[PDB]
Amino acid sequence: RWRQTWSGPGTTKRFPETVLARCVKYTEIHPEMRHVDCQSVWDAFKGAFISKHPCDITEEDYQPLMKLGTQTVPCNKILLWSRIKDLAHQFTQVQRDMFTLEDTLLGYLADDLTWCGEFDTSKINYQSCPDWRKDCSNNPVSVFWKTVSRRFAEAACDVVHVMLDGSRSKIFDKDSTFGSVEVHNLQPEKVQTLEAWVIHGGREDSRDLCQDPTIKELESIISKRNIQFSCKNIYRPDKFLQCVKNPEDSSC
Numbered sequence: 001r002w003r004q005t006w007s008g009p010g011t012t013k014r015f016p017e018t019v020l021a022r023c024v025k026y027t028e029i030h031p032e033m034r035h036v037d038c039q040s041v042w043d044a045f046k047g048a049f050i051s052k053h054p055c056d057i058t059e060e061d062y063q064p065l066m067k068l069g070t071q072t073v074p075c076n077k078i079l080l081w082s083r084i085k086d087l088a089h090q091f092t093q094v095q096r097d098m099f100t101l102e103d104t105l106l107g108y109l110a111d112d113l114t115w116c117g118e119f120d121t122s123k124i125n126y127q128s129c130p131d132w133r134k135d136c137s138n139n140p141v142s143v144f145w146k147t148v149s150r151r152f153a154e155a156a157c158d159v160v161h162v163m164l165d166g167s168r169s170k171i172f173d174k175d176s177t178f179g180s181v182e183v184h185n186l187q188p189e190k191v192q193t194l195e196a197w198v199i200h201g202g203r204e205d206s207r208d209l210c211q212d213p214t215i216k217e218l219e220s221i222i223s224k225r226n227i228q229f230s231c232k233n234i235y236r237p238d239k240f241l242q243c244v245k246n247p248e249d250s251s252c
Ligand SMILES: *[C@H]1O[C@H](OP(=O)(O)OCCc2ccccc2)[C@@H](O)[C@@H]1F
Pocket: 080, 081, 082, 083, 084, 101, 102, 149, 173, 175, 176, 177, 178, 179, 182
């Protein structure tokens, strides 16, 4: 009773109700997805992990959810991001013609949430869920993001943009979900260019972070997929967001 099963956070409280409400809200904000039956979405979501050992989840478990959440977003208007979620989302809230994963129904449902079941019972584990590193990688949360990120990267076309956190030790971390799943799923038949926006932090604007070794590593991988690579520095993300909000400002 004093022992917890896993190292990671348990299921977010009221996960069932939260997923259902987010579905209702999404279908309300976005009419093109209004055909979705939100109860059915939850059912299939639930079906992916309930009663399953939380170290034995597969992409196949999530397929019925993937089917119900079928959504075509303009393939040429996609924004990827690695480890800089906030600004990317803040960007798409203003620049409403562009989409991150979390601006899709499926991403929107799962964003910031944790969930897992218990092997061979109907219960949701509200106490602890597997940590990707300490416990096992094939857990309900990690496998969900892997599945959706693959499809999202596979649907991408034309010019794909990626926002990266220039203030990190590894600006392109080839171990991230961007690096390990998204990048290698950018199809050169569809995707002409990958353009990176490297977001600087604070008054650190003296360097061209597009010259960072990890960015050259990204350039190399992208080029070996027969995809053009472009990189821009964003020295002032504070002013960047403002210019996105009010493009009429003479300062940008
Ligand atoms: C698909 O995945 C992207 O997220 P990410 O920040 O690149 O990866 C998650 C963080 C991480 C970092 C190091 C090692 C493992 C995981 C998003 O653009 C999109 F939602």
